[PDB]
Amino acid sequence: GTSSQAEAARILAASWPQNREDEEKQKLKGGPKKTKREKKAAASHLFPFEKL
């Protein structure tokens, strides 16, 4: 079913550890990036599948 895909995606993708992380992201990211080196550190500590 067309609606089954959307329902399953909604349930799975945001079940426990997204209903509070998305809220914090929406209530944050108001100021600009402090330094460009934070992005470098994030890229170095991130796994390859999180870079695409």
The residue assigned the tokens 């991130």 is 46
Tokens standing for residue 14? 């945001």
Three-class SS of residue 19?
A: coil
What is the nearest approach in angstroms of another protein to the Cβ of residue 26? 16
Q: How far is the CB of 4 from another protein (least distance, A)?
A: 4
* Residues in touch with another protein (CB under 8 A): 1, 4-5, 7-9, 11-13, 15-18, 20-21, 35, 37-38, 40-41, 44-45, 47-52
CA dist., res. 52 & res. 42, Å (int): 13
Residue closer to another protein by CB (options 26, 35) is: 35
